[PDB]
Amino acid sequence: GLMQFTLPVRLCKEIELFHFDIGPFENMWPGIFVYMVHRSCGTSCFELEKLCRFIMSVKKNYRRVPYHNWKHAVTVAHCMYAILQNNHTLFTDLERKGLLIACLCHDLDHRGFSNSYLQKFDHPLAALYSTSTMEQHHFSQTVSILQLEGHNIFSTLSSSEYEQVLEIIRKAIIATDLALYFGNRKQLEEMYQTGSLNLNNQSHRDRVIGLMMTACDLCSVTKLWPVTKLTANDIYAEFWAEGDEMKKLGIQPIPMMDRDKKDEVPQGQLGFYNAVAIPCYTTLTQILPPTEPLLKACRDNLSQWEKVIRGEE
Ligand SMILES: O=c1ccn(-c2ccncc2)nc1-c1ccnn1-c1cccc(Br)c1
Ligand SMILES: [Mg+2]
Numbered sequence: 001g002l003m004q005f006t007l008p009v010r011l012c013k014e015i016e017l018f019h020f021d022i023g024p025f026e027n028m029w030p031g032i033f034v035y036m037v038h039r040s041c042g043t044s045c046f047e048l049e050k051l052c053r054f055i056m057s058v059k060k061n062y063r064r065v066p067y068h069n070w071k072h073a074v075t076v077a078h079c080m081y082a083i084l085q086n087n088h089t090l091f092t093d094l095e096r097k098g099l100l101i102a103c104l105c106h107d108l109d110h111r112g113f114s115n116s117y118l119q120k121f122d123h124p125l126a127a128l129y130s131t132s133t134m135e136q137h138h139f140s141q142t143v144s145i146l147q148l149e150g151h152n153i154f155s156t157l158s159s160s161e162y163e164q165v166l167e168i169i170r171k172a173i174i175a176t177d178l179a180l181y182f183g184n185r186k187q188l189e190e191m192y193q194t195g196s197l198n199l200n201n202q203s204h205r206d207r208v209i210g211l212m213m214t215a216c217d218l219c220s221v222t223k224l225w226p227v228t229k230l231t232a233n234d235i236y237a238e239f240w241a242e243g244d245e246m247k248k249l250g251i252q253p254i255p256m257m258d259r260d261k262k263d264e265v266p267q268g269q270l271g272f273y274n275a276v277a278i279p280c281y282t283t284l285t286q287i288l289p290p291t292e293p294l295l296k297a298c299r300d301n302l303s304q305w306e307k308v309i310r311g312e313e
């Protein structure tokens with residue numbers, strides 16, 4: 001109980017900031033996650049031995065893919081940490097427990113392929129889970145690891161609290177299906193603008209947590225430009241591989257996934273910022289004002305992609 005995790009001074013300070021990059025030292029990422037759980041949730045939330053065993057089994061079940069890997073899991077959990085720490089009083093004890101774990105586990109066993117590719121390939125998972133295919137798999141993997149001997153980090157919760165936290169985790173992971181984001185944000189936009197948004201309404205809380213999950217999931221676009229630009233390489237490395245696999249199925253992939261069309265990436269990034277990222281952080285900042293730095297950073301990166309198009313870099 002008296003064993004605190006402590007980071008070097010630069011990490012101790014910068015980990016509080018939304019634009020923090022967890023760095024290239026993979027062996028520091030478990031410690032970074034435990035540090036965040038301890039400060040976000042408490043030193044009492046989890047048995048350290050169980051938490052450490054859970055974290056290391058989660059790591060093992062992320063694959064060696066360019067983007068949807070262990071570093072993405074910890075990066076998304078850090079963005080959730082920053083949101084929770086900047087909104088101290090808004091979230092319940094169970095939400096703080098659930099949401100860092102949901103973020104760490106949200107892409108478990110990702111292969112670097114979209115729901116669309118799994119459906120066109122006729123992958124077994126597409127028959128098991130007709131919608132939100134990979135997201136239902138990610139939740140299934142989370143439950144599998146939680147049920148390994150000595151991995152049940154929630155063991156001190158009551159039957160009803162345990163059911164509640166696993167329901168928070170399921171909804172949070174399903175919400176990372178970007179197909180579901182468009183309608184979720186539109187409903188949240190209407191609720192905020194007509195003033196009907198009510199954080200005591202459980203169905204409203206679910207929507208706000210969904211948008212937080214999208215915001216954390218896309219948080220690569222809220223980093224300093226050099227991080228955002230280099231992460232884009234990893235994102236498109238996966239898109240281009242999926243494009244190659246579409247071509248192997250005898251299907252011309254969309255331009256975004258076609259490596260023959262790299263010239264179109266800058267304009268594609270603009271579309272993504274304007275259609276997905278900026279609207280996401282705008283609605284999140286309206287509902288949770290202290291998350292405004294994510295929107296500011298997103299807008300800075302939009303401006304950088306406009307400079308790339310104008311040949312200014
Ligand atoms: O730069 C991007 C360009 C396009 N798309 C995208 C376009 C349509 N459908 C899905 C993704 N996402 C990104 C992006 C930026 C940050 N994260 N992601 C991301 C990547 C894969 C998957 C999920 Br979820 C998110
Ligand atoms: Mg995902």
Ligand SMILES: [Zn+2]
Nearest residue numbers: 072106107217
């Ligand atoms: Zn993700």
